[PDB]
Design a protein around this ligand. Structure first.
Ligand code: HEM
Ligand code: HEM
Ligand SMILES: O[C@@H](c1cn(-c2ccccc2)nn1)c1c(C2CC2)sc2cncn12
Ligand SMILES: O[C@@H](c1cn(-c2ccccc2)nn1)c1c(C2CC2)sc2cncn12
Lengths: 382, 368
């Protein structure tokens, strides 16, 4: 960071200041399962959101809370758990049973420490992908590997909402894509040094990682069901930006005067997918371009910094295009075709889990626009 | 010192140092129109002169300084074409012979195909006498839109403020190195030096009253500075004929595109681009309208540790007082700016503010 100010933007190494783990990548490694005893009143509500919502007792338990100070959350891992705890509670409070009865005012005893801890971590006071995906997980047995069977989420909204399935499959894909992040400094160093064979090997390794990530994504069908995702999980993931149910935003009582509008949790907030579009020169950032640029403001600041540092580095696409090297172009296209495959598989999933259940009781245009931009980035056709 | 890759000058800072006054003879057809925009617009001959142009290739613009002059030339012509005499008759289609090389040269420089602060302020200037100093008397702009539009006054005062603020940019590496090295006295000296520079920049800003007038700014210059993003006059954007199929929407020139003012908010931890407000979104978007090296510098400043969090964590009154000197100087600049926008915009309209008051409020709320 100091050396980039003096010698210029050059990603010869991935700095610890970017908060990318060698193993989990953009995910929070080994998230905290428990908070200090001082916050047991928050932890009780968050760990019992399904029963509290169903019994109609949730809003009362939130309203009858004492305002706890965020000063007892010393380290980042505990501040991130608190963010996930308060975030999950806020969604449950605002949406309730999830059938029309909204709450446009968040109680001061929860809204004050929430916006305080949110300001500390530079994140909006709404549940984000970094909370319910990147920090909402644990290993059942630490010695066993990071697989679905050896993992669990920390919080759910309703019984049978498929929260574990949806969040853990997204996380397992994040970790699969993370192995290609280690290859990024190799790409920039080989471009600077003009090591063509090294760059080719690096581009093929990134493609190999994104191909393995598509295989991981097939597990969605075994852990999520269309009725539960559309009818239940979708509601608790909804935000208050451009929403007819909370047209002016949410009142963060004791923190802001007027209601504030924030976008709901979105996989458009995933730092790993945005960093491959940046790396490969896919100019993703129209409505889709604006949405993805905005979703960076919903990512952890170290990850938001990593994305802009990747944009400050030379273009891998322009470099490949300028070399008149078929093997290098074929390797670059392997990376692009792996992203097109992921986006195309994703559209198939959104048809099964959103488009079809909706017919049996937009965002399709966003995903088709993203995929179209990825496919139009190929040099030789796919 | 800050890397040469950031394109910050020791003297002018974010401004383009010694901008090129003339383009190669191959582009004399562009230069004739641009240098005669006041007469060509008034006579109604400008749109015809643009439509009767041959499509020139951008390949004869070899170095950056000439590519930036071409961007200023094509940009000024584009505003004059779209807005014409500036009284309702808009042009929703930009001719292929100008729109094609404009979007081509814009793609090269990573800038949108619309006139930006980097064109009409940072690269739209010359020294009357090179040996004399960089003062109003010894300076002039390269292009104007209409006679009596106060283009020289508005653009040169903005530029003179940019250069006044530039002297505090040299102090930035000193701040970060002293935080890393834990040199408290060095950090205090550096914070006071930055405050000194932002105090001197407020003095420079007073010249606006001597070189701009409310009637000419509101009635004339404002029109040519207007863009096509959220504009009821070009609701769908502009057609860049021979480059894009559908009309594209781009924001007009804005001092929100100044890299020097954004870098002091980043340095001092004023979260201007946070909260999800209209002001936070606008300032984040305006980074896409800055030269990429300057956009990279802003990002590099964000990647560095927080000076505000560091000062807050030390329980050091002298250090907090020095940090607050920097913040109070930015509040003073923003408050003086609001006074100017009342005289030059709010009052002439009776015969924007919410954005500037939201920015200033965020700066004041940052005091310790
Ligand atoms: C139950 C299955 C899934 C459904 C119904 C689903 C739905 C959606 C929707 C509606 C969006 C649009 C953005 C928004 O409005 O929030 C989106 C975007 C996205 N999703 Fe999924 N998703 C599923 C599984 C996954 C998984 C497992 C991943 C892996 C991390 C993933 C990665 C992405 C990415 C990266 C985007 C951003 C746009 C893009 O870059 O393609 N999705 N998803
Ligand atoms: C004739 C006098 C001036 C008027 C009427 C004026 C007007 C405005 C307006 C309307 C905006 C809002 C952004 C937009 O809509 O584009 C703005 C922003 C701004 N102006 Fe001025 N301006 C004047 C002089 C100056 C000068 C001389 C400077 C010095 C560089 C300056 C610096 C700024 C900055 C930095 C912003 C961005 C917001 C902020 O950080 O405070 N202005 N100005
Ligand atoms: O973007 C989120 C989302 C939004 N909808 C959605 C469903 C129906 C109607 C409207 C919207 N579904 N999922 C999302 C994740 C949440 C945890 C952050 S994880 C992930 C992977 N793909 C999408 N998402
Ligand atoms: O922000 C720009 C602006 C916007 N308006 C404006 C006036 C009336 C109604 C709406 C908008 N005036 N100026 C601006 C500069 C443009 C040339 C790049 S230079 C500078 C210094 N202070 C502000 N600006």
């Amino acid at each position: 960071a100091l050396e980039v100010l003096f010698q210029g933007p050059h990603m010869w190494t991935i700095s610890k200041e970017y908060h990318i783990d060698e193993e989990v990548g953009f995910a929070l490694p080994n998230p905290q399962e428990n908070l200090p005893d001082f916050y047991n009143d928050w932890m009780f509500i968050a760990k019992h959101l399904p029963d509290l919502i169903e019994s109609g007792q949730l809003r009362e338990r939130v309203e009858k809370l004492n305002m706890l100070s965020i000063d007892h959350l010393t380290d980042h891992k505990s501040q991130r758990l608190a963010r996930l705890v308060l975030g999950c509670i806020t969604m449950a409070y605002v949406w309730g049973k999830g059938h029309g009865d909204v709450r446009k005012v968040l109680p001061r005893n929860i809204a004050v420490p929430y916006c305080q801890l949110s300001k500390k971590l530079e994140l909006p006071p709404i549940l984000v992908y970094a909370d319910c995906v990147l920090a909402n997980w644990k290993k059942k047995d630490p010695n066993k590997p990071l697989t679905y069977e050896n993992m669990d989420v920390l919080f759910s909204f309703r019984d049978g909402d498929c929260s574990k399935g949806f969040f853990l499959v997204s996380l397992l894909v994040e970790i699969a894509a993370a192995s290609a992040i280690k290859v990024i400094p190799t790409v920039f160093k080989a471009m600077q040094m003009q090591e063509r064979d090294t760059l080719l090997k690096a581009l093929l390794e990134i493609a190999s990682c994104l191909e393995k990530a598509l295989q991981v994504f097939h597990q969605i069908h075994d852990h999520v069901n269309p009725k539960a995702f559309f009818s239940v999980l979708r509601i608790y993931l909804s935000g208050w930006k451009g929403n007819p149910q909370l047209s002016d935003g949410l009142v963060y009582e004791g923190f802001w005067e007027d209601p504030k509008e924030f976008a709901g949790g979105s996989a458009g907030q995933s730092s790993v997918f945005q960093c491959f579009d940046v790396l490969l020169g896919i100019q993703q950032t129209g409505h889709a371009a604006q949405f993805l640029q905005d979703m960076r403001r919903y990512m952890p600041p170290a990850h938001r910094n990593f994305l802009c540092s990747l944009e400050s580095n030379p273009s891998v696409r322009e470099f490949v295009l300028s070399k008149g090297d078929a093997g290098l172009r074929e390797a670059y296209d392997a990376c692009v075709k792996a992203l097109v495959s992921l986006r195309s598989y994703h559209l198939q999933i959104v048809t099964k889990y959103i488009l079809i259940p909706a017919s049996q009781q937009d965002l399709m245009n966003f995903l088709k626009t993203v995929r179209s931009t990825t496919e139009k980035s190929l040099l030789k056709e796919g």
